[PDB]
Amino acid sequence: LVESGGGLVLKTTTSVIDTTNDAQNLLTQAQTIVNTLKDYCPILITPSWQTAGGGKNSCATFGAEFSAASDMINNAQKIVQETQQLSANQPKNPSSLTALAQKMLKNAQSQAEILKLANQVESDFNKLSSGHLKDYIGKCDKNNWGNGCAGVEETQSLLKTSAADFNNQTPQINQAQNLANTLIQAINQAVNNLNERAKTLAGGTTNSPAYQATLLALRSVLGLWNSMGYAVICGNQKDFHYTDENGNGTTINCKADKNVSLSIEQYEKIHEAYQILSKALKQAGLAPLNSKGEKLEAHVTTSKSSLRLSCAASGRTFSTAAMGWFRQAPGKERDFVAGIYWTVGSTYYADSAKGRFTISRDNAKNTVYLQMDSLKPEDTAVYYCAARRRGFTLAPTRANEYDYWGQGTQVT
């Protein structure tokens, strides 16, 4: 028996994404996260919901939070578009002064549209953060998962303060409409007023309830993924590098179909969407709603680690018998890894090896293969391939039961 295979293949791929921080961009990322999460409902595994969700899907456990988060995002998209027209149809300031009745009627109607959706957001934010993630998503405390760390409590706080002062200003533009609904200079005050509340609603940040509402929508799915993303099952195998606000850098190692788990491609999209969203919100921030945006760079890093051991047999063929692998950690006994037996080629795996190790064999070539993935330093031993010409009833799994052995081959 002759052992072959080497080099422990390592790919680390880094996406460099250069995109702006305009709200229409960020909302698409935020939409990516929720929608792929809400529409495929993958099973999940100090947290409260961890005990209940384990085994069962996440839309039973977070179905309310998702449709609440989704609505914020959809409502945020609704928030973005109204201010897009509101920028062009600002009332200006010879008797064609009849498009000024509608440019007030439109500018004032749009503003009344802006506020109601802001209520649906915070209504849905309360629908979101008063569920299982009551006191996880809001605050921020080696590892930093499980807490949202989004700064939502800051945005919710500045949103209410921003909603309260546009309710102080309501009866005034609620009467600055009824005197403009007469269609058959006190309106020139409404132009400088609306074109001024419009100037503040679309161009403002700390004070604009249009801005602050959108920000809350964005940071929510940020925190929402921070609070439970690690728990989503995904998946050949990919490492998805994350980092936390503090500096602690984590990874996430990943049959993929609806209501079970995410495919790797599906996760790739969340991860990449998260990393952008994360990078845009903490550093340069969400741009004012009438802004074209500001260039920024996200990084997105993944990792694959793989090794193939082959084992060729100089005598006859063990395809109808038993071949297997043993691992000898430094200084110990030969511990069993995997075995494939009889010509039907049934397989058996060890405790440490299920899900990440795979044995196979090309009966035609009289070689057995061991594919190793999601490699950790806990492996890194000497690996032996071992064959058995003898018959057997139970699948052999200990060293004394195999008769032919290989030289041994190092792994790192």
Residue 207 phi/psi, 5° resolution? -100, -20
CB 316 within 8 A of CB 33: no
Total residues found in the chain within this entry: 412
Residue 118 phi/psi, 5° resolution? -55, -35
46 Cβ neighbours under 8 A, 6+ residues apart:
146
> What is the set of domains in the chain, with CATH numbers?
2-6+306-410 (2.60.40.10), 22-293 (no CATH)
Distance CA 127, CA 149 (A): 19
Q: Which of 25, 410, 61 has its CA nearest to residue 228? A: 61
Distance CA 88, CA 405 (A): 80
SS (H, E, C) 213-266: HHHHHHHHHHHHHHHHHHHCCECCCCEECEECCCCCEECCECCCCCCCCECHHH
The structure was resolved experimentally with X-ray
Distance CA 73, CA 125 (A): 11
H/E element, 15: strand 9-20
CA distances to 3, 84, 177, 354, 411 from 308, rounded to whole Å, are: 11, 56, 74, 16, 11
Distance CA 36, CA 42 (A): 10
H/E element, 271: helix 264-279
Structure tokens, 139: 């605050």
CA distances to 201, 204, 277, 328 from 104, rounded to whole Å, are: 15, 20, 36, 81
Please note each residue after which the chain is broken, C-to-N distance over 2.5 A, or write none: 45, 93, 141, 184, 235, 254
Q: How many CB atoms lie within 10 A of CB 378?
A: 8
On the CB side of 138, how many CA atoms lie within 13 Å of its CA? Answer: 14
